[PDB]
Amino acid sequence: ELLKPRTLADLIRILHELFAGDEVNVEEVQAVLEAYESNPAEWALYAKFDQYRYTRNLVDQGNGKFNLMILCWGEGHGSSIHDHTDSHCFLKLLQGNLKETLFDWPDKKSNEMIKKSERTLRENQCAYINDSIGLHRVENVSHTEPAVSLHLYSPPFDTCHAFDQRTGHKNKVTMTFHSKFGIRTP
Numbered sequence: 001e002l003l004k005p006r007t008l009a010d011l012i013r014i015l016h017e018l019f020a021g022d023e024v025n026v027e028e029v030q031a032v033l034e035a036y037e038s039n040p041a042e043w044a045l046y047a048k049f050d051q052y053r054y055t056r057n058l059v060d061q062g063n064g065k066f067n068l069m070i071l072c073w074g075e076g077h078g079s080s081i082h083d084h085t086d087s088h089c090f091l092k093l094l095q096g097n098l099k100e101t102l103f104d105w106p107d108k109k110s111n112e113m114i115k116k117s118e119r120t121l122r123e124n125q126c127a128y129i130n131d132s133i134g135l136h137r138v139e140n141v142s143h144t145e146p147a148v149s150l151h152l153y154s155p156p157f158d159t160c161h162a163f164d165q166r167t168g169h170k171n172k173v174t175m176t177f178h179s180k181f182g183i184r185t186p
């Protein structure tokens, strides 16, 4: 029975219930993530920015079933065009706005990756992506407002691919956590 999360802590407890089994009800997970109303005090501990690029801050390891993390995007910070390593990926805005640009999987032949579509994800909205849907880029295009987002991936992954927009060529990337459970992890 899906109830509204009263706090981030409550959200985490609910997510543990929803991932207790071997499968994922994506619509239920998205609904509960959307239903949590971002409260900056509850996640300030995790909102550790870097001047030069976005940061990934681990919040919960989901008893192995998922990683829950907070990403902090300075003005002008964005991601590569990337995949999600055969995992479910949910993205909820906690602060600010992010531009999501969708791309198709490239063909073998080298070619410009043309954007399929784009949308602006606004505060408290939750997006969902997986490799069967396509690839995406996520960017804070604001000149004046930092953005903060809450990401859930299941199963957890720490490697993915970045795609060259000019050719479609992919390279393996390993991502690191800027912090874990509020502690900077250089």
Ligand SMILES: N[C@@H](CCS)C(=O)O
Residues within 6 Å of the ligand: 056, 071, 079, 089, 091, 138, 151, 175
């Ligand atoms: N998956 C990316 C963030 C955009 S969804 C990352 O883990 O850094």
Ligand SMILES: [Fe+3]
Residues within 6 Å of the ligand: 082, 083, 084, 089, 129, 136, 138
């Ligand atoms: Fe992504």
